[PDB]
Amino acid sequence: VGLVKNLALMAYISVGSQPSPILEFLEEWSMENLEEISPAAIADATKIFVNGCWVGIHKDPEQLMNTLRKLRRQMDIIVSEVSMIRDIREREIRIYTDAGRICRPLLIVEKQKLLLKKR
Amino acid sequence: RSCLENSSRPTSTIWVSMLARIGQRIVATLPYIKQEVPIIIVFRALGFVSDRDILEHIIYDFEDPEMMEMVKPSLDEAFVIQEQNVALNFIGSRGAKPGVTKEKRIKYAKEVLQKEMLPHVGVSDFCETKKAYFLGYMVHRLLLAALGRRELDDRDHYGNKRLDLAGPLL
Amino acid sequence: RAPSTSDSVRLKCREMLAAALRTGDDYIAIGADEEELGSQIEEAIYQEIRNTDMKYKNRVRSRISNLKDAKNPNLRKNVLCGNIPPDLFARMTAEEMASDELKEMRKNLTKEAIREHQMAKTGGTQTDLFTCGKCKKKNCTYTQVTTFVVCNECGNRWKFC
Amino acid sequence: SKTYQDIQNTIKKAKQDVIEVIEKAHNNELEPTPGNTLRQTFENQVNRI
Amino acid sequence: GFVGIRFCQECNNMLYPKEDKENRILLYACRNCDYQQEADNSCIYVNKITHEVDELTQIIADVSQDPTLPRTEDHPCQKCGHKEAVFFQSHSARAEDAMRLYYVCTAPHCGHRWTE
Amino acid sequence: GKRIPFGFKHRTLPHFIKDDYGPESRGFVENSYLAGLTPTEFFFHAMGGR
Amino acid sequence: FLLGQSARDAERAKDILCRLEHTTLRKVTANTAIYYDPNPQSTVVAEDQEWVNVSPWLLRVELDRKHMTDRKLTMEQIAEKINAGFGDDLNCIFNDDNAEKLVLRIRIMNDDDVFLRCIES
Numbered sequence: 001v002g003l004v005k006n007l008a009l010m011a012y013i014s015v016g017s018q019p020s021p022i023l024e025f026l027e028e029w030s031m032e033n034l035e036e037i038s039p040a041a042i043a044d045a046t047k048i049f050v051n052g053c054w055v056g057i058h059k060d061p062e063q064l065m066n067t068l069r070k071l072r073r074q075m076d077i078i079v080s081e082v083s084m085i086r087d088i089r090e091r092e093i094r095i096y097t098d099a100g101r102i103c104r105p106l107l108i109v110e111k112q113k114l115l116l117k118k119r
Numbered sequence: 120r121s122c123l124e125n126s127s128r129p130t131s132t133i134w135v136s137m138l139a140r141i142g143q144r145i146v147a148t149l150p151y152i153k154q155e156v157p158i159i160i161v162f163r164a165l166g167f168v169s170d171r172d173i174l175e176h177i178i179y180d181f182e183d184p185e186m187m188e189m190v191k192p193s194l195d196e197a198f199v200i201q202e203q204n205v206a207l208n209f210i211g212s213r214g215a216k217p218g219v220t221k222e223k224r225i226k227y228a229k230e231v232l233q234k235e236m237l238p239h240v241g242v243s244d245f246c247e248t249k250k251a252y253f254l255g256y257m258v259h260r261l262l263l264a265a266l267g268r269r270e271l272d273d274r275d276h277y278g279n280k281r282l283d284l285a286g287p288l289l
Numbered sequence: 290r291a292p293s294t295s296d297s298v299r300l301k302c303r304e305m306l307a308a309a310l311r312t313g314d315d316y317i318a319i320g321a322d323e324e325e326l327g328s329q330i331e332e333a334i335y336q337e338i339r340n341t342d343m344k345y346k347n348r349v350r351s352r353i354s355n356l357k358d359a360k361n362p363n364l365r366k367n368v369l370c371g372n373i374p375p376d377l378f379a380r381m382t383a384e385e386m387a388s389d390e391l392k393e394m395r396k397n398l399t400k401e402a403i404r405e406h407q408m409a410k411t412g413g414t415q416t417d418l419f420t421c422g423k424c425k426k427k428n429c430t431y432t433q434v435t436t437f438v439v440c441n442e443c444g445n446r447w448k449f450c
Numbered sequence: 451s452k453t454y455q456d457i458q459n460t461i462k463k464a465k466q467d468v469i470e471v472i473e474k475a476h477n478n479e480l481e482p483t484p485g486n487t488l489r490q491t492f493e494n495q496v497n498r499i
Numbered sequence: 500g501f502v503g504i505r506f507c508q509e510c511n512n513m514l515y516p517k518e519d520k521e522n523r524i525l526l527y528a529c530r531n532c533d534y535q536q537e538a539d540n541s542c543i544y545v546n547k548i549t550h551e552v553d554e555l556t557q558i559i560a561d562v563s564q565d566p567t568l569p570r571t572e573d574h575p576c577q578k579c580g581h582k583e584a585v586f587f588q589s590h591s592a593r594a595e596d597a598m599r600l601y602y603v604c605t606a607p608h609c610g611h612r613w614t615e
Numbered sequence: 616g617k618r619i620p621f622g623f624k625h626r627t628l629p630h631f632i633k634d635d636y637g638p639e640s641r642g643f644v645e646n647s648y649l650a651g652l653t654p655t656e657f658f659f660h661a662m663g664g665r
Numbered sequence: 666f667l668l669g670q671s672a673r674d675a676e677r678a679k680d681i682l683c684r685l686e687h688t689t690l691r692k693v694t695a696n697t698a699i700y701y702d703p704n705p706q707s708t709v710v711a712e713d714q715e716w717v718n719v720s721p722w723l724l725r726v727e728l729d730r731k732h733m734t735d736r737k738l739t740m741e742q743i744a745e746k747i748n749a750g751f752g753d754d755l756n757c758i759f760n761d762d763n764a765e766k767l768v769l770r771i772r773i774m775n776d777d778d779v780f781l782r783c784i785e786s
């Protein structure tokens with residue numbers, strides 16, 4: 001009892017993707033790479049983790065996360081299975097793309113009104 | 120639990136633990152190493168002789184001495200290891216297959232310190248910098264947990280679990 | 290009148306006590322002999338201890354500090370005015386020599402600690418409709434969950450289904 | 451149909467009481483009950499309510 | 500007060516303290532190098548048993564832009580005087596016993612934090 | 616022997632906001648089996664049965 | 666189960682409870698700071714307690730007031746115990762019970778730097 005489980009009707013498992021397009025897209029932006037960076041510049045910044053690999057450092061999470069969300073919404077460079085997590089308390093953006101990340105679809109609500117209109 | 124990507128070798132585990140109890144002496148349990156090794160010796164083995172560099176990789180801000188008082192004990196514990204060769208010898212002496220000579224032990228230590236531990240960050244010829252930064256991040260997280268500034272990570276939280284469907288199983 | 294002493298340590302302690310008693314000039318306003326009071330205090334301390342060991346020196350130092358404490362000159366004024374006899378001052382403890390505000394704060398802290406040390410009483414609906422068979426009294430408290438009966442005075446524990 | 455009114459009134463009263471307890475705890479008025487910490491006594495009061 | 504680590508000048512290593520027996524002063528020597536420097540803090544170690552840490556020093560201004568954090572209008576800011584503001588508990592382990600909130604202004608270029 | 620814990624970061628479920636110690640946000644089921652149950656309290660009731 | 670009159674009143678039972686409860690310095694101490702004060706009369710810190718009482722280092726172990734009153738202790742017995750437990754090797758200069766801060770001063774008289782750390786721990 002409790003060990004055996006069953007998925008939910010809407011539950012879906014990520015099949016898996018590749019991190020290369022994401023790495024290239026984050027590299028084009030103003031993202032200093034982890035290999036050449038002043039250690040003193042890590043405090044006032046946010047550490048980006050992709051598939052558990054600490055790479056690059058950014059100085060504007062509030063915009064980077066919005067760009068990532070819009071890009072994923074448009075389904076062009078990042079597949080819908082990828083997930084970007086935003087950690088507010090500690091500045092860390094941990095992105096994952098390996099398989100096995102159980103997920104489900106949810107509607108989007110911009111301010112107080114859904115996008116699933118009559119159209 | 121590090122694992123590069125469906126690689127031939129199995130996933131490797133890195134336990135960077137800390138003694139309870141001087142007190143507060145951080146250790147590590149590297150793969151294929153039966154005994155424990157302090158983190159400072161590992162950092163010096165990766166190619167960091169200077170102490171300031173090691174602390175910068177571990178601790179990001181120096182204006183909080185309250186965090187510095189926690190690392191001073193373990194830092195001073197390993198004060199007889201400065202050069203890289205002695206650190207490599209010390210790490211290899213604890214290997215499962217201790218080389219009968221010194222050169223074999225150095226080679227074995229370098230191999231375990233470049234292929235076994237943290238294979239996901241990189242297993243190429245020159246990736247010691249990223250490994251050192253990742254290790255420093257692990258130590259930073261451990262210290263934050265010890266101070267209580269960040270709650271521990273729940274074991275049953277599925278956010279830290281992955282499902283293996285028919286694909287990976289086959 | 291305190292008997293004179295030829296011991297150097299005792300004389301030094303008496304001089305220190307007199308000097309401390311002179312802090313604030315309360316002796317002039319009260320017209321009390323500071324030297325006589327210091328000699329009496331030293332004599333009481335010597336009688337209580339009966340040796341010029343570290344305990345006697347510690348007691349003398351504590352008395353000097355308490356008498357010279359500028360945060361509670363009322364104690365010094367009372368001592369110089371006869372309110373606290375020299376025997377009592379020598380035999381008094383640190384808690385007794387504290388100022389009125391300090392004493393009130395200590396009492397409040399002690400009361401709070403005593404109250405916090407207690408344990409919360411078991412809750413329940415107290416009523417006199419159930420007669421306890423272990424004491425014959427009617428006071429008791431019940432709890433519905435089967436209704437458990439808890440005696441108030443006798444403490445008879447039972448349940449009704 | 452009247453018992454429903456009584457039950458709803460009681461539930462609303464309990465909700466108001468627990469909200470008041472939370473407000474007091476937030477503004478630092480609920481003193482710690484003897485033998486327990488602040489969180490413990492807060493939880494005990496909520497459970498009793 | 501506290502004490503911070505001061506690295507060497509040449510070898511850049513931990514400087515251990517040393518009580519100069521000759522001049523009767525406080526020095527910081529290097530285990531490897533022979534560097535010396537006259538001290539100024541006159542302190543070596545301090546322990547905080549109560550661990551009286553100011554939670555405000557840990558809170559950051561970025562917490563304001565959190566979509567899963569409550570907001571209130573009854574606790575306006577002080578500097579800018581904006582109305583909207585967030586509030587939350589210490590959110591830190593080892594909480595002794597207190598749910599005292601930590602209000603943070605919800606507006607750009609302010610990042611003010613206070614407590615009531 | 617306690618109320619519903621905070622499985623997520625300082626909240627029971629994603630619906631409720633952080634630091635919500637209210638009754639309905641920690642397991643208090645306000646409805647009854649005759650009048651149906653809210654999904655959140657339904658899940659908490661399932662936890663108790665488990 | 667209390668036997669004496671303490672069974673009735675809680676005032677005379679709190680002391681019994683305190684004496685049956687294990688109390689150590691950690692429960693009563695609030696801050697502990699070591700200083701390499703060369704001359705005892707120099708007193709790098711502002712405290713007018715050493716000149717009245719009279720090694721180039723000392724421990725300033727300031728105690729808490731609320732806990733000390735809760736357990737109802739006095740600095741006299743604390744100093745006596747701390748001096749007898751470690752032999753006639755140190756010299757604890759306690760403070761009067763009138764000042765606001767409950768400071769202390771532990772000094773050693775007769776590798777030496779870590780000795781104070783070890784002993785305080």
Ligand SMILES: [Zn+2]
Pocket residue numbers: 507508509510511512529530531532533534
């Ligand atoms: Zn040096």
Ligand SMILES: [Zn+2]
Pocket residue numbers: 576577578579580581604605606609610611
């Ligand atoms: Zn503001």
